[PDB]
Design an enzyme around this catalytic site. Sequence first.
Site, PDB file in Angstrom:
ATOM      1  N   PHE A 209     -13.422   4.068   2.220  1.00 19.03           N
ATOM      2  CA  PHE A 209     -13.074   3.643   0.874  1.00 19.03           C
ATOM      3  C   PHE A 209     -12.001   4.597   0.339  1.00 19.03           C
ATOM      4  O   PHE A 209     -12.070   5.820   0.494  1.00 19.03           O
ATOM      5  CB  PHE A 209     -14.313   3.665   0.062  1.00 19.03           C
ATOM      6  CG  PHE A 209     -14.229   2.926  -1.216  1.00 19.03           C
ATOM      7  CD1 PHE A 209     -14.398   1.556  -1.258  1.00 19.03           C
ATOM      8  CD2 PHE A 209     -13.973   3.606  -2.422  1.00 19.03           C
ATOM      9  CE1 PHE A 209     -14.303   0.867  -2.550  1.00 19.03           C
ATOM     10  CE2 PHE A 209     -13.870   2.894  -3.670  1.00 19.03           C
ATOM     11  CZ  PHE A 209     -14.048   1.577  -3.734  1.00 19.03           C
ATOM     12  N   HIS A 212      -9.755   6.851  -5.602  1.00 20.01           N
ATOM     13  CA  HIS A 212     -10.153   6.209  -6.885  1.00 20.01           C
ATOM     14  C   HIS A 212     -10.744   7.252  -7.866  1.00 20.01           C
ATOM     15  O   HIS A 212     -11.071   8.409  -7.450  1.00 20.01           O
ATOM     16  CB  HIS A 212     -11.189   5.105  -6.670  1.00 20.01           C
ATOM     17  CG  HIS A 212     -12.530   5.622  -6.292  1.00 20.01           C
ATOM     18  ND1 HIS A 212     -12.785   6.164  -5.064  1.00 20.01           N
ATOM     19  CD2 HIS A 212     -13.697   5.635  -6.966  1.00 20.01           C
ATOM     20  CE1 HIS A 212     -14.045   6.565  -5.030  1.00 20.01           C
ATOM     21  NE2 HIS A 212     -14.620   6.253  -6.176  1.00 20.01           N
ATOM     22  N   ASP A 214     -13.933   7.299 -10.607  1.00 20.01           N
ATOM     23  CA  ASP A 214     -15.079   6.471 -10.968  1.00 20.01           C
ATOM     24  C   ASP A 214     -14.955   5.764 -12.350  1.00 20.01           C
ATOM     25  O   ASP A 214     -14.384   6.351 -13.294  1.00 20.01           O
ATOM     26  CB  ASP A 214     -16.357   7.324 -11.008  1.00 20.01           C
ATOM     27  CG  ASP A 214     -16.888   7.620  -9.672  1.00 20.01           C
ATOM     28  OD1 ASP A 214     -16.231   7.209  -8.703  1.00 20.01           O
ATOM     29  OD2 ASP A 214     -17.944   8.283  -9.541  1.00 20.01           O
ATOM     30  N   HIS A 268     -11.298  10.983  -5.732  1.00 14.86           N
ATOM     31  CA  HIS A 268     -12.019  11.204  -4.524  1.00 14.86           C
ATOM     32  C   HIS A 268     -11.958   9.923  -3.644  1.00 14.86           C
ATOM     33  O   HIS A 268     -11.444   8.839  -4.061  1.00 14.86           O
ATOM     34  CB  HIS A 268     -13.435  11.707  -4.861  1.00 14.86           C
ATOM     35  CG  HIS A 268     -14.237  10.752  -5.701  1.00 14.86           C
ATOM     36  ND1 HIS A 268     -13.855  10.362  -6.961  1.00 14.86           N
ATOM     37  CD2 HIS A 268     -15.446  10.174  -5.481  1.00 14.86           C
ATOM     38  CE1 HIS A 268     -14.762   9.536  -7.458  1.00 14.86           C
ATOM     39  NE2 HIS A 268     -15.726   9.386  -6.564  1.00 14.86           N
TER      40      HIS A 268
HETATM   41  C1  W05 Z   1     -20.616   6.406  -4.390  1.00 14.84           C
HETATM   42  C2  W05 Z   1     -20.112   5.066  -3.739  1.00 14.84           C
HETATM   43  N1  W05 Z   1     -19.231   4.301  -4.711  1.00 14.84           N
HETATM   44  C3  W05 Z   1     -18.653   3.134  -4.426  1.00 14.84           C
HETATM   45  O1  W05 Z   1     -18.890   2.401  -3.410  1.00 14.84           O
HETATM   46  C4  W05 Z   1     -17.564   2.673  -5.370  1.00 14.84           C
HETATM   47  C5  W05 Z   1     -16.680   3.782  -5.823  1.00 14.84           C
HETATM   48  S1  W05 Z   1     -17.369   4.925  -7.090  1.00 14.84           S
HETATM   49  N2  W05 Z   1     -18.048   1.979  -6.525  1.00 14.84           N
HETATM   50  C6  W05 Z   1     -18.030   0.697  -6.766  1.00 14.84           C
HETATM   51  O2  W05 Z   1     -17.718  -0.122  -5.920  1.00 14.84           O
HETATM   52  C7  W05 Z   1     -18.426   0.255  -8.216  1.00 14.84           C
HETATM   53  C8  W05 Z   1     -19.682  -0.624  -8.261  1.00 14.84           C
HETATM   54  C9  W05 Z   1     -20.205  -0.976  -9.648  1.00 14.84           C
HETATM   55  C10 W05 Z   1     -21.458  -1.863  -9.574  1.00 14.84           C
HETATM   56  N3  W05 Z   1     -21.280  -3.079  -8.759  1.00 14.84           N
HETATM   57  C11 W05 Z   1     -21.821  -2.222 -11.044  1.00 14.84           C
HETATM   58  O3  W05 Z   1     -21.846  -3.433 -11.391  1.00 14.84           O
HETATM   59  O4  W05 Z   1     -22.068  -1.262 -11.816  1.00 14.84           O
HETATM   60  C12 W05 Z   1     -19.465   5.346  -2.339  1.00 14.84           C
HETATM   61  O5  W05 Z   1     -18.201   5.248  -2.343  1.00 14.84           O
HETATM   62  O6  W05 Z   1     -20.231   5.609  -1.334  1.00 14.84           O
HETATM   63 FE   FE2 Z   2     -16.605   7.146  -6.529  1.00 13.27          FE
END
Ligand code: W05
Ligand code: FE2
Length: 329
Positions: A209, A212, A214, A268
């Site tokens: 990923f 980005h 948060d 990150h």
């Molecule tokens: C920590 C985790 N985060 C992620 O996968 C990423 C980046 S922070 N985050 C997202 O996709 C946001 C999801 C929001 C969720 N559906 C909601 O409705 O609130 C990772 O990257 O392992």
């Molecule tokens: Fe994140």
Amino acid sequence: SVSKANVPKIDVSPLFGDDQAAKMRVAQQIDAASRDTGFFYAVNHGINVQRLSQKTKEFHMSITPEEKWDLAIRAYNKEHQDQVRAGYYLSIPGKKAVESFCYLNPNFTPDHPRIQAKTPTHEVNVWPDETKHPGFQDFAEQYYWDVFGLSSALLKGYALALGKEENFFARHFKPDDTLASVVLIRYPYLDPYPEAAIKTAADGTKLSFEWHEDVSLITVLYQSNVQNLQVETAAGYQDIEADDTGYLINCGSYMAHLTNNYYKAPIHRVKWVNAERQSLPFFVNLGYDSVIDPFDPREPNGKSDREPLSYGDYLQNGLVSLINKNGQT
Ligand SMILES: C[C@@H](NC(=O)[C@H](CS)NC(=O)CCC[C@H](N)C(=O)O)C(=O)O
Ligand SMILES: [Fe+2]
């Protein structure tokens, strides 16, 4: 040859208590981390996190393709128009490795005023059949309240860190209206590993990923002991070491908004690593109509030029932009 990032371990236990000076000394550590790499691990947090790991592994490993269709969000199943946020986010063997289950506030039932009025970002959780997943809904709901309790305590630390009274954020973080979410992410082992699931950074690093910030006030994250996260610093990207006894914490872009970038939302990304692992974030989001005045702790007077931004518009727009920048998960 990548560096380790300064990610201090901070004992947050005093934020649950009533020793004010001890709370200030915790707040000073949170201020320091928030201004350095922008990460820290909260320890002595009191959450039963081996149970969280085990129950989540149980769910992820027993759920069938049939169940996943029946729980799927609108992006994977058109029948499911109300589910933009809550439900299952499917794998695509050969293409997409990650999969996950998102749920919201459990107090969002058909009778909550916000789902009666069809307010965006508010949904009723979907759940698997009880007898196929015994105890799962009960476990997951209670986890939501356990991390909510942790997050509530952290936010008292952030408030004190910033020179405010301790309830400054926490008074707007309420069980009745919070738009916080838990996501239970599975990052699987595979070979062949599907190549379309790996991105390559500008420095050559393979990723699951991309970079980005948060979308959150703060993010409260449990991860298995596999090393994967990198933060961007003045000196380049650094490795965040894993600690499966702790909660990795960081500010999201709303804290940066509320503080005029004084507490930045650290950039990150997630390295590609071919190993079975779990990422279980709790996104600390406030209620739909929460609109704290932005301030500036740099300024003698504390005044900011930034305009207030209601949390719900922030969140709806931010979630959509994250998908556009970094793909549907
Ligand atoms: C920590 C985790 N985060 C992620 O996968 C990423 C980046 S922070 N985050 C997202 O996709 C946001 C999801 C929001 C969720 N559906 C909601 O409705 O609130 C990772 O990257 O392992
Ligand atoms: Fe994140």
